[PDB]
Design a protein around this ligand. Structure first.
Ligand SMILES: CP(=O)(O)N[C@@H]1[C@@H](O)[C@H](O)[C@@H](CO)O[C@H]1O
Ligand SMILES: CP(=O)(O)N[C@@H]1[C@@H](O)[C@H](O)[C@@H](CO)O[C@H]1O
Ligand SMILES: CP(=O)(O)N[C@@H]1[C@@H](O)[C@H](O)[C@@H](CO)O[C@H]1O
Ligand SMILES: [Zn+2]
Ligand SMILES: [Zn+2]
Lengths: 267, 265, 267
């Protein structure tokens, strides 16, 4: 498009006409979504209110849990194996409150999620099988995010969504009858410091906190005394951006902006 | 000695470090342009490569990976794609006056982040002793390609470590010297350029040399990439009041370590 | 909390009342700290004046040096092995100047510090043995920090402070008689672009510079011509933030803010 005079015009038209980027109803046509969490409890903590709205709308929400949450206890009589078995049941109960009926467990060990082609292949197999319309994952660019399983889950989610569409990537999936990932309409990153789309969850907030507290091994009373205010305050930070009390924030960009794009901060 | 941080900083830059962004590529005779995939050098700095070649600077590509994954055409294997892209790059490079291409042959999507890859880059630095090195900026936000982030880090690392005789010492044992000798790094594909090359004049040649990578840029893909690539170029060019530009981040060598005020340049 | 009106009010109550955070005197109660450095000389460069002030207050300061500094010369007649043995001696003399009596050498090769569970277990064994009240380490989010041993030390130090409190993490430590890390009261990150606590080192600058120069393999006169003004300029950058001539900066945050937090820039 050789005749536009200003960057600001080129940018507006690139987004609205060339890429048809829309932040007004980005989940509009979604029939099936995957919600990718590093640990058991992260989908509900990051976006439980939105999962419920999606389910209320008849969207099929499927979790993919990267790790088993093996390490998340300070109880010296509770082994990692026993804790992982308990957290699987806690996630099932939590997910059921939010209308989720399927969880893919990848079973990597908590604190030890690899950053590797292998983990991309696991995600790629699920994407190719399920062909979701949209995928949710943490923002790996969150500053001061000190948990490796978080940063890696975000990177590996975005990478797999792109690479799962290439037939020479993990080519054995196609040899067993799966198609390339054909169907996706969006990625939405939660746990983000740069949200550009907010779901009002004011009405849903008590359901969210309830479904979070179902992860009892994680949230005994003394930890909840700190975590409840922390989670309320995060929801208010997001809410305020659309003038509501409580929200969940997502960063959504056109697919090209995830590569070589020097003006990602303009959205 | 001096009164304020401001004075300290200005002095440090101008007199102690002699940092000049008016003409950073002034004395360059040989440069390495390090790209993650075949086409990255032409997309990110093709116009600048042309300008450099036209002024008699020798431009040498180092391409980290083989572009094996880059197709959705199920009739084309990665081996065949790789072979096609080597030829696409050779033709695209010829258009820009480019000489010589080192192919490292790591598989696309699988470039390792490791001492091994730093030794490969180091061997080339010590052999070629370039005046300057260009690479993607690994700090680019929302850069989701690991081949890009890893290439950026590894280049900066290798420019540093190839200067050290205990690093990859078998190089010296076979008769290579440590890398002098470069006077700069410049990062392209950067959100924080502080040097902009006007390429308004060369934009058409740039687009032609990009399209030479035909496996990457069929018509339906070009419908989106041409507006994107033009908008990028307008983004950079607007910063210096020209139509189409190419942006680079250049900093003094000290600033890539322990420096809390890098955003001041 | 469900009754707080605005995000701005919730954030303030969270920070001050729930998390009890303030930066009036963060190092106040400390009897023992670990100063974790990527290379020999990094503690003194990043925080030497502070180390001396901690030793002057009777705090036991202990270094953990991740790597051997094997690569850090341009002298073609000096092997890395010889350099490593030299730099150990340099660090010992540097450390004695600042009142430090104990250094754990992990002995990873310089330029080759792994980013792995193994290195977290090394740091966890020392945390569990020492039970320090605080830990200092480089900020791994420093922009344009190009040295992988720096970013890796920072991330591993933060992770280790957290995972070492978990008894299923590196569980053989417990089996041989070490307790989980508790005692911990803070992490302070030095080499930071986002300091929120400044230590005035104006009258200690000359001692800090002498203690840096004791690392002679690193700072012969021709290198010092550049590094002395560089190091002065950094110290002025931090000092200016509290209206003094030379400072050392640290970033300190509540434990919760190192995870899933989208407003860490408000502190
Ligand atoms: C809210 P979360 O992300 O789920 N909390 C995780 C927990 O799941 C995990 O078991 C633990 C050990 O890695 O670190 C905690 O930080
Ligand atoms: C502009 P580019 O960096 O060269 N485009 C790359 C292409 O080379 C590569 O084959 C593919 C799969 O990794 O990803 C694409 O995103
Ligand atoms: C101030 P420093 O962080 O200690 N300087 C280091 C030095 O210790 C190390 O041997 C060399 C090679 O890795 O890199 C330099 O950048
Ligand atoms: Zn988590
Ligand atoms: Zn260091």
């Amino acid at each position: 498009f050789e005749d536009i005079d200003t960057f600001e015009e080129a940018f507006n038209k690139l987004l609205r006409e060339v890429l048809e980027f829309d932040l007004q109803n980005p989940f509009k046509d979604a029939k099936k979504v995957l919600c990718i969490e590093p640990h058991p409890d992260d989908c509900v903590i990051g976006m439980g209110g939105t999962i419920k709205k999606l389910s209320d709308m008849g969207v099929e929400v499927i979790y993919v849990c990267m790790t088993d949450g093996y390490m998340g206890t300070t109880d010296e009589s509770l082994s990692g194996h026993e804790l992982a078995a308990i957290r699987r049941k806690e996630e099932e109960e939590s997910a059921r409150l939010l209308g989720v009926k399927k969880i893919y467990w990848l079973n990597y060990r908590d604190t030890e999620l690899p950053y590797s082609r292998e983990v991309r292949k696991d995600l790629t197999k699920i994407l190719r099988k399920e062909q979701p319309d949209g995928v949710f994952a943490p923002d790996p660019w969150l500053p001061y995010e000190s948990h490796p399983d978080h940063r890696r889950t975000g990177f590996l989610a975005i990478e797999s969504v792109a690479f799962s569409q290439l037939p020479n990537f993990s080519n054995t999936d196609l040899d067993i009858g799966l198609n390339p990932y054909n169907s996706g309409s969006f990625i939405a990153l939660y746990y983000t410091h740069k949200p550009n789309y907010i779901v009002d969850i004011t009405d849903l907030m008590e359901l969210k906190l309830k479904a979070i507290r179902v992860h009892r091994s994680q949230f005994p009373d003394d930890i909840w005394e700190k975590w409840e205010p922390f989670l309320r305050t995060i929801a208010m930070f997001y809410g305020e951006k659309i003038g509501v009390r409580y929200g969940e924030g997502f960063r959504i960009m056109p697919g090209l902006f995830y590569h070589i794009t020097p003006f990602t901060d303009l959205i």
